[PDB]
């Protein structure tokens, strides 16, 4: 995973009404998210999920070239009857350990 | 949590008020990252002024030493709680236990 | 005279001006580095506030004049980070600003 | 600042961090930087070392 | 020779430039009272010459270095004019004092003198008149090259 | 430049030789405006230019007038370093 | 150039003229600039008001200055003071040089003086 743009959120150090988790725990859960891509070198993934329950790996809008490997990997729990998340997950190739500060 | 504990971690975790403890025994109604809502059980419910318990968690604020003090929900929804039990893991607290 | 808070400044580039609002205040969440400008503060050095002979001749000639200086709050050197909150306190009887 | 080891050094030398070096030797940077003519005037060198 | 508008536009950039570099003066003077003496008075003569940002002043510093690196005399009088803000006649005096009886041979005859202060004016003037004309299309593209 | 350090007890007229004036008034600054006063502690005309080559009233604003005292308060134009030791 | 008897003559006429107008005894129809000055507060004053509005109709800036000096009664030094306050940088072949900057106060005093003398000069035969 490279970077995530969740919708109604200014920045990582705040919350979102409708989820039990903080933003920070969510994207650290996404740091462990594994996926397989074939035809590209970068790709943007998208999830849209409402309703009470856990947010699994299944709720992304999958394609034919991308492939999640662990469908059970949880992200968060929606707690509201009517709330949703809509992030866009940018994913690219790479090699090694790259912190966020050393870029550009 | 630390593996080699010393048994005191419940006590110092509770008595430090940087965690948020259920004042009455109840059942969780509504979990949120910011607030938390408890349905009060009937026995501990006062006859007049029935009411429910609403606790508001402390989010990111500046400490005395410029560090992050923050509280997290450690409970699920639809769940019996006990009077005098931990609800919010505050900073360096885990599941009611103190952990540096 | 007083001092002002707005995004009007003398003689810095548009780089720091990119990250303020219309009121002269950084948005919540704009990541900044050291030496960046948080709030553009300026002083009117040379403000007049004179007799209605002045305001007469200001109505005659126009209001062009009395604009100088700057004392913007700048980020300390070497530190960086992310804005998470803005607090504004306003003395009573003073006009509150838009972001306030 | 705070000391640490780095045993790979020979003993006629010590480690030193790049930030503290770039702060401590600023007038020498001005001097040789004027010499090479990478910047003529001084305030040019000020913004170059900044 | 250059034109009138070019002289204006380039002239404004150069006074912003030498104003900027003049702020990199080595040391001033002042005191520990005078600032307190200063904020509650209206001074009068605002000596605060305005300057550009560091991007423009650095950029056109690279421009002026990029052409004017070949003559240090013309560069020096350039900094005299915009940096210190001194007049043409003033550096006609400074320069005329130490112009050095270099035995320049005039249309009068063989002479051992400074060229006159009446001479040294048009000496100065033909320098920077050519100099701005030299550097102008370079700089005018240079803002466009960033653009 | 100089050899040994010599001390001695102070003669009165030696102290008169050291001074440039007598202090007379127990104020130091204006507090209303921010001026130093006539013959208070922080004095100009005893101690010198609080500004730099310039008078209190600003009568002699340039380096050309160097040498002559003022007249609206009577201060000699010198550096502001000179108020460190008079 | 005018003479000094013309100066004192028409000077006294502008004194009773501005003292007449500034009381508010003049109508909007003489000028919208006279109306502008009346937004900022007998046949002799109306005859002269036709004269002065006729000659100084075309500039309106020194006409307003003329109202400031005569109608309101302002000192010359304050007028040049505010005029130096509203100054823009201009090209003048200065004592300093042909650089482009805000002029000095004494220059502004000179300009109020010459716009005074030229104003009175253009008024007087009318
Ligand atoms: Zn004086």
TrEMBL record, chain E:
This is Antiterminator Q protein. It comes from Enterobacteria phage SfI. The gene is Q.
């Amino acid at each position: 995973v490279t970077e995530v743009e969740i919708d109604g959120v200014l920045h990582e150090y705040s919350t979102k009404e409708g989820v039990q988790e903080d933003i920070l725990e969510i994207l650290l859960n996404l740091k462990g998210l594994a996926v397989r891509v074939q035809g590209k070198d970068e790709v943007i993934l998208t999830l849209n999920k409402s309703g009470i329950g856990p947010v699994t790996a299944a709720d992304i809008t999958h394609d034919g070239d991308v492939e999640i490997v662990k469908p059970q990997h949880v992200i968060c729990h929606l707690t509201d009857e009517n709330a949703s998340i809509s992030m866009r997950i940018k994913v690219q190739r790479g090699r090694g350990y790259v912190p966020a500060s050393t870029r550009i | 949590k630390p593996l080699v504990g010393t048994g005191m971690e419940r006590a110092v975790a509770v008595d430090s008020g940087v965690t948020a403890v259920a004042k009455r025994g109840g059942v969780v109604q509504y979990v949120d990252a910011s607030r938390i809502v408890i349905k009060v059980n009937e026995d501990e419910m006062y006859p007049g002024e029935a009411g429910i318990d609403i606790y508001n968690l402390t989010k990111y604020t500046r400490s005395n030493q410029n560090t992050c003090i923050n509280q997290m929900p450690c409970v699920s929804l639809g769940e019996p709680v006990e009077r005098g039990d931990v609800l919010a893991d505050g900073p360096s607290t885990d599941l009611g236990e103190l952990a540096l | 005279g007083p001092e002002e808070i707005t995004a009007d400044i003398p003689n810095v580039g548009e780089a720091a001006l990119s990250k303020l609002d219309e009121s002269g205040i950084v948005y919540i969440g704009a990541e900044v580095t050291g030496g960046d400008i948080l709030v553009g503060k300026v002083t009117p050095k040379g403000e007049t506030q004179l007799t209605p002979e002045e305001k007469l001749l200001r109505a005659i000639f126009g209001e062009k004049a009395s604009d100088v200086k700057d004392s913007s709050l700048r980020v300390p050197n070497g530190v960086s980070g992310t804005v998470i909150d803005v607090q504004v306190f306003t003395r009573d009887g003073v006009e509150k600003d838009k972001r306030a | 600042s705070v000391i640490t080891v780095g045993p790979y050094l020979r003993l006629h030398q010590c480690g030193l961090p790049k930030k503290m070096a770039l702060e401590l030797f600023k007038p020498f940077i001005y001097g040789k930087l004027e010499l090479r003519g990478l910047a003529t005037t001084i305030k040019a060198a000020k913004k170059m070392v900044e | 020779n250059l034109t009138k508008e070019q002289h204006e536009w380039l002239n404004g950039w150069l006074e912003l430039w030498g104003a900027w570099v003049y702020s990199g003066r080595l040391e001033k003077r002042m005191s520990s009272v005078i600032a307190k003496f200063m904020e509650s008075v209206e001074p009068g003569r605002v000596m605060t010459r305005p300057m550009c940002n560091d991007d423009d002043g650095m950029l056109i510093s690279q421009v002026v270095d990029s052409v004017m690196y070949i003559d240090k005399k013309a560069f020096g009088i350039l900094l005299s004019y915009y940096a210190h803000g001194s007049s043409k006649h003033a550096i006609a005096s400074y320069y005329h004092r130490v112009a050095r009886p270099r035995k320049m041979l005039c249309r009068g005859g063989g002479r051992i003198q400074k060229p006159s202060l009446a001479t040294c004016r048009r000496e100065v003037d033909e320098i920077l008149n050519a100099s701005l004309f030299m550097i102008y299309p370079v700089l005018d593209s240079a803002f466009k090259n960033r653009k | 430049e100089f050899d040994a350090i010599k001390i001695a007890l102070a003669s009165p007229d030696m102290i008169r030789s050291w001074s440039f004036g007598e202090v007379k008034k127990p104020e130091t600054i204006n507090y209303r405006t921010f001026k130093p006063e006539r013959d208070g502690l922080f004095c100009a005309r005893i101690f010198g230019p609080v500004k730099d080559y310039e008078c209190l009233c600003g009568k002699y604003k340039r380096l050309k007038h160097r040498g002559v005292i003022c007249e609206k308060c009577g201060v000699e134009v010198t550096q502001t370093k000179v108020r460190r030791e008079r």
